[PDB]
Design a protein around this ligand. Structure first.
Ligand SMILES: [Cu+2]
Ligand SMILES: [Cu+2]
Lengths: 288, 288
């Protein structure tokens, strides 16, 4: 990969990266924060993958979530991927297209060409980062957490479940996730656009449908925060739907939704709860 | 004074305000964070930190990227984020670039009374809003600290010195400040535009000149951070001129400039050092 820019933050560094992606057939932008532990003289640092919401680039969470303080405190690295392929040659209002790939492998043209964000996030990007950085000093593949906000919250829960039986991610949380995009207005527009009008091809990407037949094991838990003043809550987020979907299943008591008063959708909300989630992921990654 | 929006953050609230400014004669935008202490309602009042922003910024930038809120909760202060000019071409000068001066030149004198705005009008307006529901929790006037970034770091130091006889502010710090605006390009342009080309008006606003004949009292200290990877440092900030100014002065030994390696001018630098500045302001405000 190519180092675009580095920033000193806390005891470590935020690095802006670009690389030519095979999944998307274009150049991609990725931010990573390396904690103070990476630069300490004289075992692998686990990683947290944070997926962003509609319209965001990697700079938004990097600047406004303050994960970096939490990364130094516990000893993890954190990766901020992009939300879609970008560029003049890529097909492209705020809720679909560029900045809005919904973490799916597109089948409909002209999106199919560049919109393979499911493969980009869970397959290509981790071992690309592994090639670049790795002595495995950093674990991108085995001991890894996934989290995110909104559409990113959706991507996180979706990736965790679809990989659960093979233990793909060892930890999962979300901030204001869209839990059931197949029957919600903002999720139907992306599904129709990328996957076509056949609703059966949607099913494989829908947390509420996927979770029912995944056998929960151990004390594994999904942590969700959502604010009661979130303007998207009633119409698009509908976190209730997932609590209903796990009723009478092995997952019933292991999806923890915390509805918090006064908080909205913003990074003021996110940054407030970053420390609690950081503690959550660090425990699961065996750091405390 | 009028409320525009009101987010929950950490244990408290960030309120976006607007009012008709008599000194700018325009409408003005101000963000204020109120800590968890303000909403715990079962003696001594909550003090205020005034954070002045740099060239270009609105109150929203520091509100979102500095994470003062966690520190305000930790120690028990309020924090006010004023704007950098009247609102309603060039980035050195004009809107977002008022330089915390009372402009004497036309047509600027009309609206660019930013010194009176910061130091007289705003604290009294805020006081009238939060303690003219007839009962008093905050202190915008007596127990107050001042801080800032770049142009804001200049304004903070300048305000602290000009009001030192009477202790207008009980505490002062800066992030990558412009210390000697008279001797610096971007300072000379703003000074020429607002004040004219007459030096008795210039020296009344220059900290390096002001500090020499102000009698230092007690244990008062000015805390400054700067990065060595700051692209503005070498030409425009030049923080060590302030160390030379206080040479053989009662202020010698009381100006603390921490140069930290690898940090730049960004909010990655500011936010890294906010917890230390917060502790500093907290002692001086008698909160710890
Ligand atoms: Cu490389
Ligand atoms: Cu009012």
């Amino acid at each position: 990969m190519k180092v675009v820019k580095e920033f000193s933050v806390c005891g470590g560094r935020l690095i802006k990266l670009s690389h030519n992606s095979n999944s998307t057939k274009t150049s991609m932008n990725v931010n990573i924060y390396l904690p103070k532990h990476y630069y300490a003289q004289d075992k692998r640092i686990p990683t947290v993958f944070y997926l962003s919401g509609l319209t965001c680039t990697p700079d938004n969470a990097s600047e406004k979530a303050f994960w970096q303080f939490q990364a130094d405190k516990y000893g993890f690295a954190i990766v901020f991927p992009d939300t879609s392929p970008r560029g003049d040659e890529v097909a492209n209002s705020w809720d679909f297209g560029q900045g809005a790939g919904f973490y799916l492998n597109a089948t409909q043209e002209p999106y199919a060409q560049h919109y393979q964000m499911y493969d980009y996030i869970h397959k290509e990007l981790p071992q690309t980062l592994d090639s670049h950085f790795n002595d495995v000093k950093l674990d991108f593949l085995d001991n890894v957490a996934i989290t995110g906000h909104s559409m990113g919250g959706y991507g996180a829960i979706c990736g965790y479940l679809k990989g659960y039986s093979g233990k793909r991610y060892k930890s999962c949380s979300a901030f204001a996730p869209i839990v059931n995009p197949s029957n919600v207005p903002i999720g139907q527009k992306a599904f129709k656009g990328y996957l076509g009008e056949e609703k059966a091809q949607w099913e494989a990407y829908d947390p509420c449908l996927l979770i029912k037949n995944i056998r929960h094991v151990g004390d594994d838990r999904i942590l969700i925060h959502v604010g009661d003043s979130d303007p998207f809550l009633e119409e698009h987020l509908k976190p209730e739907l997932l609590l209903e979907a796990v009723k009478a299943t092995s997952w019933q008591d292991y999806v923890e939704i915390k509805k918090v008063h006064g908080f909205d959708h913003s990074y003021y909300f996110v940054s407030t709860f970053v420390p609690e989630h950081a503690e959550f992921h660090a425990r699961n990654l065996g750091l405390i």
